């Protein structure tokens, strides 16, 4: 039959192409060419064609010979998988070291060896950080296990896989070198985040949710357990940074793999179409496409025997990116997968023209086509016009295997439902909604009586003896024991916080029902849970978030017990906010989700249940006396702090002759009486002494960083100012915050609070951060202090004391008011704008445009050369930070605003004239000339001297600051006149203005 | 960081047995899966470790030696070698055979271990390398080998038995499991299996020459091997081992075994002489053999033995903290009972070893214990643990393959088919005129007849791999049993005839009596050692030059006897070849498609080259031509050019002409010139060595070389050719004919050579020369170089006769002394004399002190006999030696009859 002949031809092709270099025993093919190495990604990718051929042969075998062929293919791919797994399992020490903290030195090697599976290079001669390879390996391992090919034999391998799951679970906040092993855009590799790694890791994490490695004949302990919060975080990160691969690359063709056949992890198909169209418009060429803009690989320049690209990429690597047909061969598979046919034929016809015929007349895919070294000038004027020639190695197993698999799939022998048995092709189907269940409990009989007074029927903590409730930290400590082994030196999952997605589900521990309360009602960590409105808003946000995704099965369950702190001052009734929240929970509409209340008895029959099997059994004495006798919280806090700093970090004060009362002990019991008075004047002080740290700070920091913003900690000036431009570990971030905060102590708590508020508000309303590029905490706090001082008309110390006393909700309200933006009226506005440096949305583009027609813009001696226009691009961050550094030389915010206005008016006026100034423009001279003209006009009008005053240290009339921008008497006209006069001063006696 | 191969394999087998037992439950909750996966992982790891070393296998395939031996000990963490071969030997073949047997057993069970086709090639090369284990000595199971422990290798019967069992198991089996067409089969040679069986049978009563008995003989005649299918001899060996090695706390390794005893010290790897005498009486006890005995008992269906061994094993067993059973490795005696135990054997109590309380265990012992307990508890059946049916009872040994014939065990009435093919049409019609029916090769057009070299080349082409580098099956001649089958090459049937019929450069192939005898011997060999299904095929060819006029009658006699139907008690059948071919199973080889003289030496030595050339040109006598060619070769060289081409070509032509004319002296001279040797000396020397005798190669009255261990053909050839260049001219061919005749006679009449230990060809040559001279009497003695092969054979058989009266007793004594014959029981009589001789015995100036021989050797040890023979070999006159031996026998008898 024709099918048999086609299968025989494909088998001959794959045998002659890939299987000829299998390297028996080891099972790992060489990574092409005469390199004598084995890359993990290529080894994983070069097996899909063989797997598909075996799958196609198996269903139509019905014969002894075809049975033998399919058996050989499956056994060979199994051997390759085992050989790949051996190299990773030989390096358990690196995985264990990487499980705690994140560093480049404790990472698995990216290039393993041939026979004997040894190491070839050290830890300082290559970039050994590739999460995508491990993610794709795990995803394909799960897919093959679902297919029915045994790859796992021993139970210790299950523990190793569980450890690797935690090894790759932190990819959403870990920076790696990248798929291209070249760090960021330029050389001298610096670790940075990219969307490809998280996109590859999310699908791998999702695949191993409940897939057993022992097949249909497994047991209780055969399934890998994964969480759900990490998947949601990765999805959010990918959605935030979908259009751009990273913060340094505008677009990368590697995003195709994420949004195509391997590892479908995407939503909002409009984004898929947008990124596909962008890639097609930007990277398409004549015989292929480029990886990314400005790459110099295999170029007649760059001196290839030299690494660490010098910062001289002006035009030496522009429009000469060679080609890469891999993105072309991905498109045919992407089209043929879901529903496209005409695109498949078009891409196949395009690809057949670029093919090269070698020995025995078989398809061969070249790596890249290099531009001729002589015809380089023509390409600069006529891009994508000059013919190219092949260059470099071309035994590309990856592209050849992908093309063979695509051709086999298009031939119709195999169906799309066989390659993926997990049904990952239906990720674009909308989910309508989810109903949320909420249970209400009373802490004691008094609370139950109070709720039954108002008509709310609940049950106490008792009477439900079969069901028990404990906080979520116990759940985290219990989870910290999964996948632990003593012989192999494995410590299990490290301790981490638990989200709402984990506590919602029910749990089974030794034939018992367990329920865990949400984390945000914890009072022994921070004071954020001491405010009722705060509790209400976090509850609403958590309800909305839980109702949003809920990608699990069954209805969720939330337990919200009422504590003693939720009552009023008299302790005889619940607060108005609490009763309003419960009444809104009733009637099935609260926040932005449907809420149904009841009793735990009914929710038991319909709720997700999780079975846990790993838990189954296998003179200071005078000072102390003064402390005892004295009263008032101020004196107690002062003496406790002094004794702690002097002699009592852990020393016993001996205050009680019977019980040894430590300094930490007394400080902790101080919280009990501090909480009752609700005195927000020393609770922050004592929290600073105890050095309490807010949980989930690192995720907030990475969320703030992912929005293309630069963070800053500390008060000015520099070097004390820091700049966190990359994510940092929790301990490193805490120590950096402490060093920036110095000995003021409370500054660290205030900065953490402000960061929490900013992270919370960014998600809800990501539109108020426009016109801002760099966030400085110290300037923000100074702004709040100055605003409070103005509002209360008091001294700075009184304003700071009032700000410290302010409730956290009041602090949030003040921050929102400041961010929204809602003599003495115009000067205050100018001062605020200069302090927050709210530049317009297109200032940098106009600056670049005017720079293109002059030699530079000098400010108070410092000059910005015009040669920078060709070394950078307007979209590049370095240009923006350079202009900001040039601008912020003056300390006065009013001067900064005047500088900005004068620059903008100069850019506007430059459009009318068509000429080149060819000279340095000093804007301070423009401002001084405009001020002199305004002074002369006001003197001509007849104003007395008192009105036309002089500033103490700037020489600019305060009435000029008071002047409105527009109008017939505004500063804009004076600035324009001064700019025109200066331009005429350096013009060849002719303007020739025309528009 | 050290690991063996036996313990891991035994643990894997125990895990597989436990999983097989657990398979019987449909709700096993994956317990069986873990055990199958662990066994598969262990097998894969061992296979990877074996295939890691590839150069050593290729080297061992050509020149086996301890240097080229495969390593057996390596690091566990990375699977790499750790300790040098100069401190462990690394020569052990039992492990490979046991691994192959367990692997084929597991594959037949239903497991999968082989991935691709390269593993098939590796298994084929492993089989090829292990096929030649019957000659190379091993280091033994215990790694010590000799009891003296000096650094010598010896033959072990257990290794031969295990290799034979693996060879039987691996024959004709699909390695891929359920599915397989032509790329999962293994080919075996019957000659190697036959030789292994002969070696096992010859060396079965005694495990080794230096060991009377050993406990290592148990796992080879038991469940792991099940290779002794003799019943009476197996029972005798079992009774002997039980009687001689039974102990209170278990079974000892062997007598006089100072293995990790109290007196042993960790400062001398090799034991000093006479230390073994001091080391007796403190031998350790190993209770692991109780489990093997219990397994044998349950396999044989004898519950009483199982109960008795369970009751014996109950008290010695230890317990853990949780009470889990413990099997300690060995038992030792404290130093305060070293001497008291010697007086009373076993009356005192021993002490447990370190691995009997906590922190140390014995995985092999625990695995054997759990296997034995599982077998005893009836949780499984003997059929399940033996899917291949290694052990069969007496009533089923009727139609098995490779073990017993269809006629029954105690029956031998096989009928062999014989095919008659002519050579020429004239010979065919000449035979037909006398009533003889033969068919010309031109009338069997569908059938083709090929020589033996084609099959050897086809076998050589097999087993070649390019990824690793494989040379395939070595170029070795194929035995008669292999050629007795019919093959199919490229769709064409291939038949071959035995190597006796092809033209041979030697001279005895022209004597028809030798051909009659050798075809009769081949027929007897086929009758005795044929076990395949289907009647064997025999091909005979008759050549026109064979009759040669007057020599045409006895050929008629043999062929008429063949037509009658019976040849010396052997039944034969004759018919057309095509009729026999049809309806018969044909072997398939499918790999190919996939892939007095007037010249004296002294007188003519100084003659010039031109004179010698002219004399050669104008002379017609054969002897003068041969001597002139020899002088030219010695003086000028083999590359010289004469009137008839090169010197070598002229020598070959004159040698062939002499063979055609059959003048024996010239043929022998030419054969000596051509430096040709027979390809059967190695089997003869190896069977002589395995028998217990010794052979020495040399000339009478000159230097002689003694051989005590098997050697490569190259070294023996070089030694004999150097000796031949030293002393004489034609002694090479005479020695070859004598050795082939002696080997044939001892193979067909072993009882004839009884009483002789050292076989010397030169002394036997002098013996028949003297006898022929005596027979000649007044007539001058005939030269032995001109004797026909039949006359030489008759003379050798006449001298080999036990001799009778009538002739002079001096001649009889001379013949007996020349043959080095010794009376039966002479060695034991000498030993008893030495025991009752306080001073010693001095002969020919040699001294035999009593203390070292009594403190080193024992009653039946062969090295004491070797020392006695060396002492007695200094006698020059053989008659004097015979008289001395008779006097020694008389002294022994007289002294034994009276102890006063």
UniProtKB/Swiss-Prot annotation, chain A:
Belongs to the phosphorylase b kinase regulatory chain family. The keyword Nucleotidyltransferase does not apply. GO terms for biological process: generation of precursor metabolites and energy; glycogen metabolic process; positive regulation of glycogen catabolic process. A lipid is attached at residue 992 (S-farnesyl cysteine). Although the final Cys may be farnesylated, the terminal tripeptide is probably not removed, and the C-terminus is not methylated. This is Phosphorylase b kinase regulatory subunit alpha, skeletal muscle isoform. It is a lipid-anchor. Its main location: membrane. The modification Phosphoserine is found at residue 885. Keywords: Calmodulin-binding, Carbohydrate metabolism, Cell membrane, Disease variant, Glycogen metabolism, Glycogen storage disease, Lipoprotein, Membrane, Muscle protein, Phosphoprotein, Prenylation. Residues 667-697, 823-858 are annotated as: Calmodulin-binding. The keyword GTP-binding does not apply. One of its GO terms (cellular component) is plasma membrane. Muscle specific. Isoform 1 is predominant in vastus lateralis muscle. Isoform 2 predominates slightly in heart, and it predominates clearly in the other tissues tested. Pathway: Glycan biosynthesis; glycogen metabolism. Hexadecamer of 4 heterotetramers, each composed of alpha, beta, gamma, and delta subunits. Alpha (PHKA1 or PHKA2) and beta (PHKB) are regulatory subunits, gamma (PHKG1 or PHKG2) is the catalytic subunit, and delta is calmodulin. It holds the Pfam family KPBB_C. InterPro entries: 6-hairpin_glycosidase_sf, 6hp_glycosidase-like_sf, GH15-like, KPBA/B_C, PHK_A/B_su. GO terms for molecular function: calmodulin binding; phosphorylase kinase activity. It is found in: Cell membrane.
From Swiss-Prot, chain B:
By phosphorylation of various serine residues. Hexadecamer of 4 heterotetramers, each composed of alpha, beta, gamma, and delta subunits. Alpha (PHKA1 or PHKA2) and beta (PHKB) are regulatory subunits, gamma (PHKG1 or PHKG2) is the catalytic subunit, and delta is calmodulin. It is found in: Cell membrane. GO terms for molecular function: calmodulin binding. Pathway: Glycan biosynthesis; glycogen metabolism. This is Phosphorylase b kinase regulatory subunit beta. It comes from the Eukaryota. Its main location: membrane. It comes from Homo sapiens (Human). The gene is PHKB. The lineage of its organism: Eukaryota, Metazoa, Chordata, Craniata, Vertebrata. It is linked to Glycogen storage disease 9B: A metabolic disorder characterized by hepatomegaly, only slightly elevated transaminases and plasma lipids, clinical improvement with increasing age, and remarkably no clinical muscle involvement. Biochemical observations suggest that this mild phenotype is caused by an incomplete holoenzyme that lacks the beta subunit, but that may possess residual activity.
